[PDB]
Amino acid sequence: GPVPSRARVYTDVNTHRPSEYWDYESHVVEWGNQDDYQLVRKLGRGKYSEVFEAINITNNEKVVVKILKPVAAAKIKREIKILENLRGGPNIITLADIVKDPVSRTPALVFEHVNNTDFKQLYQTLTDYDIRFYMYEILKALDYCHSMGIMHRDVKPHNVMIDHEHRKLRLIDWGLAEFYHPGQEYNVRVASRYFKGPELLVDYQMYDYSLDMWSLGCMLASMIFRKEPFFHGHDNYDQLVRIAKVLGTEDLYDYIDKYNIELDPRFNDILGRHSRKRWERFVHSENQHLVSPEALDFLDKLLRYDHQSRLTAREAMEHPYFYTVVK
Ligand SMILES: O=C(O)c1ccc(Nc2nc(-c3ccccc3)cs2)cc1
Numbered sequence: 001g002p003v004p005s006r007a008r009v010y011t012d013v014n015t016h017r018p019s020e021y022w023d024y025e026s027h028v029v030e031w032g033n034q035d036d037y038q039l040v041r042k043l044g045r046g047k048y049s050e051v052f053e054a055i056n057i058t059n060n061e062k063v064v065v066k067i068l069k070p071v072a073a074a075k076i077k078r079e080i081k082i083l084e085n086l087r088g089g090p091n092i093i094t095l096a097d098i099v100k101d102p103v104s105r106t107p108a109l110v111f112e113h114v115n116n117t118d119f120k121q122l123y124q125t126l127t128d129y130d131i132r133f134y135m136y137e138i139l140k141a142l143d144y145c146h147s148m149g150i151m152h153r154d155v156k157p158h159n160v161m162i163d164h165e166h167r168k169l170r171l172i173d174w175g176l177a178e179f180y181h182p183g184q185e186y187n188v189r190v191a192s193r194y195f196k197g198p199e200l201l202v203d204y205q206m207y208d209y210s211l212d213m214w215s216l217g218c219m220l221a222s223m224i225f226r227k228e229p230f231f232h233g234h235d236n237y238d239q240l241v242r243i244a245k246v247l248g249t250e251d252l253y254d255y256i257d258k259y260n261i262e263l264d265p266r267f268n269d270i271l272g273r274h275s276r277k278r279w280e281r282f283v284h285s286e287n288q289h290l291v292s293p294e295a296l297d298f299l300d301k302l303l304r305y306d307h308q309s310r311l312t313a314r315e316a317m318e319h320p321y322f323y324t325v326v327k
Contacts (some may be wrong), residue, residue: 153177153191188205201237201240258283
């Protein structure tokens, strides 16, 4: 069987807290008035919710209303508890109200409004300074939630709202977020394909906060190399092959050896043999101004197969890559 693993930081934060903090099933929802909000336009639809721009007609303030689908309506108590526990934290989306949608009959979450710019238009238009500035802002949010015993589990560009005009950032969609308990085996069907950590791809269930740091590394590689996404898998199996063509197969085998994991035998006919690549192979005339020795050292310390060997969010904030950022 697989060898157990524990987070190297914030290991026992939930073991000391009173049951009320992490026992989300026991939480009682204080429902507000849905008629306080007037829906303006549909912003988007996912497999778990529909998002709307709305107006709070009492104070004329712009808000965002997230109406959960019945499939996600089952684990509403987890998302509500997490959002309340993290409320006021640096760069964390602020939950303003919870109401009962009259049409879906499911809960609807009301949030503060952020004037976001499409990442497919922004993230790939930033300067070297701005990439460093916004990465530091994301790290503030990740260290905060990890210090409060929570894993985000869906870090990706679409989950980071940025008001580039005001230089304001918010980490959103805490629908897949979970409380970290040492020794707990978790569902590997989390995060979006391109941002899934190797622990998920090899079906290793005893993962931790370090999963968010792999996802952050994928975001950084895409920004500094101008390649969207960086690891472009056709499916979950091809996703691991794309990673192995860059990081090499020897360190992958060492990883699975260390944790006594048995790879799905379907990998025997698709993985092949690959040496680790130097990051200069991805540098070209169009992205060279975004690349520095500090950016490459930082990336090297996030994109590691071994989840225990990755920089934590606090260690990442100490990195020379951020020395140029005004604090
Ligand atoms: O916690 C959440 O899930 C959450 C919080 C705040 C959120 N704000 C906003 N979303 C959008 C949006 C959503 C989907 C497609 C296009 C635009 C614009 S401004 C969206 C979602």
